[PDB]
């Protein structure tokens, strides 16, 4: 039914069990990707060649899955964490916030 698309999601580190090594932030807006990668192809959706090929294969052999809707542009955030032995250290974490989605 609904097509590939970014969606809201707030991630709260206490809820995830990480509060004890991540001192800050307490959480962040990660967002996520969900929705069908359909056939007919949808002109507005970003898909690799392989994804297109695979959509077509799926359309006649359905033991081959449709392409998946996944993050396609991500961005980083900073976190302040506790190392091996209690030293507060600041790191940048790649690929943490979904910026855009696509079919892969």
């Amino acid at each position: 039914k609904s097509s590939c698309k970014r969606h809201p999601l707030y991630v709260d580190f206490s809820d995830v069990g990480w509060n004890d090594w991540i001192v800050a932030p307490p959480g962040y807006h990660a967002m996520y990707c969900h929705g069908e990668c359909p056939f007919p192809l949808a002109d507005h959706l970003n898909s690799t060649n392989h994804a297109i090929v695979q959509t077509l294969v799926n359309s006649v052999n359905s033991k081959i899955p449709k392409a998946c809707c996944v993050p396609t542009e991500l961005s980083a955030i900073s976190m302040l964490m506790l190392d091996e032995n209690e030293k507060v250290v600041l790191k940048n974490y790649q690929d943490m916030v979904v910026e855009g989605c696509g079919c892969r």
């Binding site: 800050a24 507060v88 600041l90 790191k91 974490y93 790649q94």
Partner: protein, 67 residues
């Protein structure tokens, strides 16, 4: 260990560092030294064991007895 990180660099030796989303919590401060970010989490005094009300000053980290 679960999520993967690279430690942050910075440019101006010995001066205060403001990291959006990290350093705006009053109890967290950073300073650029050795081209990297050293941050601290300040700790607070325990307080009069009969305090019933507590307030913290704007921008202050530790709460104190209002009364």
């Amino acid at each position: 260990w679960l999520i993967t990180g690279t430690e942050a660099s910075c440019e101006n030796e010995g001066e205060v560092l403001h990291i959006p989303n990290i350093t705006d919590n009053p109890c967290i401060s950073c300073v650029c030294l050795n081209q990297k970010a050293e941050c601290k989490q300040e700790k607070c005094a325990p307080l009069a064991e009969d305090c019933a009300l507590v307030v913290k000053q704007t921008g202050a980290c530790c709460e104190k007895c209002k009364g």
